[PDB]
Amino acid sequence: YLETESHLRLFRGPSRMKPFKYNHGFFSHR
Amino acid sequence: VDEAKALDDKRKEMLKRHPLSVMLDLKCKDDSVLHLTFYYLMNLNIMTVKAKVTTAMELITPISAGDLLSPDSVLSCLYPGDHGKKTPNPANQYQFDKVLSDYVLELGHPYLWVQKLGGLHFPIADHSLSASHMETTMKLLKTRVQSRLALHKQFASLEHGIVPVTSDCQYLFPAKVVSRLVKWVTIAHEDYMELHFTKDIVDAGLAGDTNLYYMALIERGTAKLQAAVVLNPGYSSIPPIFQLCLNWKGEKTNSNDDNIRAMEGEVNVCYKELCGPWPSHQLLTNQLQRLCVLLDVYLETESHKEFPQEKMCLRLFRGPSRMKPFKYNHPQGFFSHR
Amino acid sequence: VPLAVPLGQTEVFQALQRLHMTIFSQSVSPCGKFLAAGNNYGQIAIFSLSSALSSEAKEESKKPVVTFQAHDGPVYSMVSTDRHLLSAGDGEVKAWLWAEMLKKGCKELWRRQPPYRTSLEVPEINALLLVPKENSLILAGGDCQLHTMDLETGTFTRVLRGHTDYIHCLALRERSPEVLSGGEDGAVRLWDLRTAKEVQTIEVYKHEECSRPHNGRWIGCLATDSDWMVCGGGPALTLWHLRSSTPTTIFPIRAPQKHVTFYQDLILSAGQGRCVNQWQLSGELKAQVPGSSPGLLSLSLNQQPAAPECKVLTAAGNSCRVDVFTNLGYRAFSLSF
Amino acid sequence: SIPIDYNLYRKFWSLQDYFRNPVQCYEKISWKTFLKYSEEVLAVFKSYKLDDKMEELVYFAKFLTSEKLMDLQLSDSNFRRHILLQYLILFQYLKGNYVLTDEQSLWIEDTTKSVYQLLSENPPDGERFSKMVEHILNTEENWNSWK
């Protein structure tokens, strides 16, 4: 939440969701 | 006009300069001018040129600039080759055999393009022979002087350990870089051929006499990379060629490692990805910045830990040669394989 | 020594491509007369081998008679049939006719691509195995899976899932298991084609006689004598006895070996070194014949009927040239790409 | 048929023709071809490495200049002894117009020191045979000093 906040994809969906699912080694969306 | 109205003594009267000479100067869009003086030899039927590049500023030169704007070898290879050395017509070679480079430095260089400007056709002056060659050679001179001044600015920046990248080229590279340039020293030809890891450039025919030979040294933590650089004088049309030797653990060179050869392929063969706009005089800095990025990739993506892997490569090896990912992808920002 | 100086942007660029060329694959024609070489840049050269080995031979006879761009990515594998040349490139296999690749047309027959996990990498195809007794072709690569394809119709029948990392090489020995496969995970696996299952696994890094943890665990080469196996790569060049899975002898060499094969009663090897290594089956280094490349990636015995004069050993690797051995003690000549 | 290296055949018997006429090794182009061909043939001799108790288990007088054999002779050691002795006799003859470049003399000394090492690498008694060759060539110099 602190690193991916704007000043492989950063947002998706109507609520502009951040990627919080871990892949054992990158972050995707739920 | 009074002289125009009209065994060492034989050598002096054979190399007799005509008392009338022509002098033409160009100004470029860098508040700088190029002065050419064309001289004629009536005993040889050959006209030569002296050159002089002068800027409006004081032109504080760096150490490794050297033979960039030195008037002995500025216009040496406008066309591919021509060397500034040998006389064009073999009849003069037979005449001098009946009876030189010091006289070349004293008088000027007998090129082929100068004599095509004069109208001399060597297998009587002609305007139609001079016509198209005039515009082509003036365009080539205008590019050559701008290229040498841009290399002068880049070398003045590179001696301070800073790679000068422009605002346009920032999409070519990732943001964070760890490896830095600590040494940039011009070397000599024989010093280039004394190096053990540059046999292939010499055997291929690319390490000629009329080149500029440089040594870059790029480091990370206990990681030293010697990069020998060859420039021929047709820069921004023919790229510099690099040779790499990594003295990190033992001596990982081009003959005993394939990822070294992959980095050399990413720099030398794929150079047209690094050239920017039409005045693409920023090619050498883009090659050095890409080679810094490749050293970062080679050190972080190596399997076992002195260097943590922060790359998003998503696959570490592929192919029979077990290749590391060296291609950068900018709109998503990640490393793939070539 | 610098005989040819290029002096020109196009010729300097061609000299740079030749200087940075790697030749991955080799194939032979149905007759002995032609050779096919795959390229780093996705190109294919065709070598008139009988014209090179003739008594009348020119310096321009050691050149490709037809070279052509064939794939977008590198050509990692070739194989040849009674009529076709199958070439695995980017992620798919193309087919070429030996009769038409010499001509000016150079069209492809088909273009088959196996089904994937839809990941965004487009994985490679490292090894092509051409299976007799049934028209089939086994694909293996970065998908970590063995695909079987019919040669007549482009349908994919079996998918085999045993490895953890990707595969480097395949083998064939004409018995009940009949398919060996070695990969980056470090285990030679046996694949019975009838049951489409894994029947035996030989982990070479687990055995302490072979381990060598400095280079890592990756199997680059396999070979079969229908009872024996030669496994090499990362760990060591080892002779395994099948049905026992016991390491019998070790071949004492430092450089990792990228390719191995059985000769009449020798073992031929090539790797990161310069020379071709000739071993005896007991484990004694019989010979080392120096090649022109700094490293080699492929050997090929051209043992074909109806052309006994084209019986040579061809070697290729990290160069733009192919070493041709008319005898096993010295190189005769080399074919430029 | 059996595959045949024709290039090694042609260069080898051109060297034989140079041995039959030692006067020809004083021009420029013939000497350059002699340099290239002799260094290539000595490279083949260094790189083959016979390493032979086989001899423990009709006389051929002249050389058999046949295209088809060319490999049964390279596998033998007597053929190598004949060719290296013929090199040494040519080099001893050239040490006795008719000037030599100093670079040519350095090349002769380097190739002589290599050919003695190659004769030491013949498997039956290379060192004793090399000592015999040294003493016989010294006495040949003493004999040539008389006539």
Curated annotation (Swiss-Prot), chain B:
Tissues showing expression: Ubiquitously expressed.
Posttranslational mods: Phosphorylated on tyrosine upon binding to activated CSF1R; which causes a dissociation of the two proteins.
Domain of life the protein comes from: Eukaryota
Subcellular location: Nucleus; Cytoplasm
Region Tandem RWD domains, residue ranges: 1-338
Annotated function: Component of the THO subcomplex of the TREX complex which is thought to couple mRNA transcription, processing and nuclear export, and which specifically associates with spliced mRNA and not with unspliced pre-mRNA. Plays a key structural role in the oligomerization of the THO-DDX39B complex.
Annotated family: Belongs to the THOC5 family.
Assembly and interaction partners: Component of the THO subcomplex, which is composed of THOC1, THOC2, THOC3, THOC5, THOC6 and THOC7. The THO subcomplex interacts with DDX39B to form the THO-DDX39B complex which multimerizes into a 28-subunit tetrameric assembly. Component of the transcription/export (TREX) complex at least composed of ALYREF/THOC4, DDX39B, SARNP/CIP29, CHTOP and the THO subcomplex; in the complex interacts with THOC1, THOC2, THOC5, THOC6 and THOC7; forms a coiled-coil dimer with THOC7; together with THOC6 and THOC7, plays a key structural role in oligomerization of the THO-DDX39B complex.
Protein name: THO complex subunit 5
Full-sequence portion shown in this chain: 294 to 683 of 683
From Swiss-Prot, chain C:
Residues where Phosphoserine is found: S176
Keywords: Apoptosis, Developmental protein, Disease variant, Intellectual disability, mRNA processing, mRNA splicing, mRNA transport, Nucleus, Phosphoprotein, Repeat, RNA-binding, Transport, WD repeat
Stretches forming WD repeats: 18-57, 70-108, 120-161, 162-201, 211-250, 252-289, 291-335
GO molecular function: RNA binding
SUPFAM superfamilies xref list: WD40 repeat-like
Record-linked PROSITE patterns: WD_REPEATS_1, WD_REPEATS_2, WD_REPEATS_REGION
Family, per entry: Belongs to the WD repeat THOC6 family.
Functional description taken from the UniProt entry: Component of the THO subcomplex of the TREX complex which is thought to couple mRNA transcription, processing and nuclear export, and which specifically associates with spliced mRNA and not with unspliced pre-mRNA. Plays a key structural role in the oligomerization of the THO-DDX39B complex. (Microbial infection) The TREX complex is essential for the export of Kaposi's sarcoma-associated herpesvirus (KSHV) intronless mRNAs and infectious virus production.
Descriptive protein name: THO complex subunit 6
From Swiss-Prot, chain D:
Full protein name: THO complex subunit 1
Phylogenetic placement of the source organism: Eukaryota, Metazoa, Chordata, Craniata, Vertebrata
Shown part of the complete sequence: 227 to 392 of 657
Domain notes: An intact death domain is needed for apoptosis.
Keyword DNA-binding: yes
Region (Dock domain): 1-147
Gene behind this protein: THOC1
Biological source species: Homo sapiens (Human)
Tissue: Ubiquitous. Expressed in various cancer cell lines. Expressed at very low levels in normal breast epithelial cells and highly expressed in breast tumors. Expression is strongly associated with an aggressive phenotype of breast tumors and expression correlates with tumor size and the metastatic state of the tumor progression.
Superkingdom, taxonomy of origin: Eukaryota
Modified residues (N6-acetyllysine): K62
The keyword Zinc-finger is assigned to this record: no
GO cellular component, as recorded: cytoplasm; nuclear matrix; nuclear speck; nucleoplasm; nucleus; THO complex; THO complex part of transcription export complex; transcription export complex
Swiss-Prot/TrEMBL keywords: Acetylation, Apoptosis, Cytoplasm, Deafness, Disease variant, DNA-binding, Isopeptide bond, mRNA processing, mRNA splicing, mRNA transport, Non-syndromic deafness, Nucleus, Phosphoprotein, RNA-binding, Transcription, Transcription regulation, Transport, Ubl conjugation
Assembly, per entry: Component of the THO subcomplex, which is composed of THOC1, THOC2, THOC3, THOC5, THOC6 and THOC7. The THO subcomplex interacts with DDX39B to form the THO-DDX39B complex which multimerizes into a 28-subunit tetrameric assembly. Component of the transcription/export (TREX) complex at least composed of ALYREF/THOC4, DDX39B, SARNP/CIP29, CHTOP and the THO subcomplex; in the complex interacts with THOC2, THOC5 and THOC7. TREX seems to have a dynamic structure involving ATP-dependent remodeling. Binds to the hypophosphorylated form of RB1. Interacts with RNA polymerase II. Interacts with LUZP4.
Molecular function as annotated in GO: DNA binding; RNA binding
Induction remark: Up-regulated during cell proliferation.
Family recorded in the similarity comment: Belongs to the THOC1 family.
